[PDB]
Design a protein around this ligand. Sequence first.
Ligand SMILES: CC(C)C[C@H](NP(=O)(O)CNC(=O)OCc1ccccc1)C(=O)NC[C@H](C)C(C)(C)C
Ligand SMILES: [Ca+2]
Ligand SMILES: [Ca+2]
Ligand SMILES: [Ca+2]
Ligand SMILES: [Ca+2]
Ligand SMILES: [Zn+2]
Length: 316
Amino acid sequence: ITGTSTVGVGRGVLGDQKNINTTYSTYYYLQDNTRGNGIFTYDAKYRTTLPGSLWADADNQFFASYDAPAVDAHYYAGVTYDYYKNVHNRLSYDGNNAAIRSSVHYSQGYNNAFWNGSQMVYGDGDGQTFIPLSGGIDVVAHELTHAVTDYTAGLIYQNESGAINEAISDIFGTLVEFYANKNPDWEIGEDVYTPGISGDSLRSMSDPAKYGDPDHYSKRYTGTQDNGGVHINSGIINKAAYLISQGGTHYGVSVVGIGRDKLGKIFYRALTQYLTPTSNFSQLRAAAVQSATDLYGSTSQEVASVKQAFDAVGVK
Ligand SMILES: CC(C)C[C@H](NP(=O)(O)CNC(=O)OCc1ccccc1)C(=O)NC[C@H](C)C(C)(C)C
Ligand SMILES: [Ca+2]
Ligand SMILES: [Ca+2]
Ligand SMILES: [Ca+2]
Ligand SMILES: [Ca+2]
Ligand SMILES: [Zn+2]
């Protein structure tokens, strides 16, 4: 909408106060004009018709319980935009400052979040498996990263390419969580998963097997559930990425860690210059090796560590 840029204040899903960029024209809207061609947050009103209504508020204060998922979807989309622009010189998901749209309060008891081809969509959860999913910065960044993937490598959402697609979203979701630097970890969704159980998470990148996901290619899922295991076999790539950054010895193979920033540079370059819609895990290894070679040189520690990490997870 046309209006003037304003700054509201509210409370997110976890109860934390934050400032949000809004737009005033009769109402205060969740429309942040400070980033690209805007970040827009919508109310789906417990229904499934999208996007719903651009979020309107009478007073620019967002402290109601109903407001909390919108506050966080809006704010964490801003952090994710900043990460891509400041760290990778990428302007929004399309590289040309496309408007970023999110809807919250999608459906009833909805234990998921997704990119629908055009926008991000967040359930509220059922209060048992999830609380409103936009409360996780890693979740928000995971969702926006699906848009980045779709505009770049285009990894088809099934089988190995789909597991790479998933892992890319978990990797960058985690790197955004570290960028914001509030309780960062290598776990996925811990802030919004299972409010009655402390210390768990939906997935672990450092130890995927803790939640039943494979940490070696010999343990990959080959059935048809979950689009051929896209949220399962992502553990193999998530573990490789964790090892590249943090190091470790895994199934007897030692990896020298090179840190998160270099992990992000390598995987961003692979995603945007080498991967294709049909890339498989072996092709991801080759893309990561070539990316590290471009950035750091063929004789570099970084190249050697990429090779060690893929060896450790059984991907040649
Ligand atoms: C980070 C996490 C909290 C949320 C993430 N959502 P996502 O991966 O973005 C789901 N997306 C999806 O299924 O898209 C299908 C599609 C394809 C095309 C158009 C529209 C939709 C996820 O890991 N979901 C997995 C869920 C919870 C289980 C039950 C399988 C474990
Ligand atoms: Ca208000
Ligand atoms: Ca965390
Ligand atoms: Ca996390
Ligand atoms: Ca929990
Ligand atoms: Zn995903």
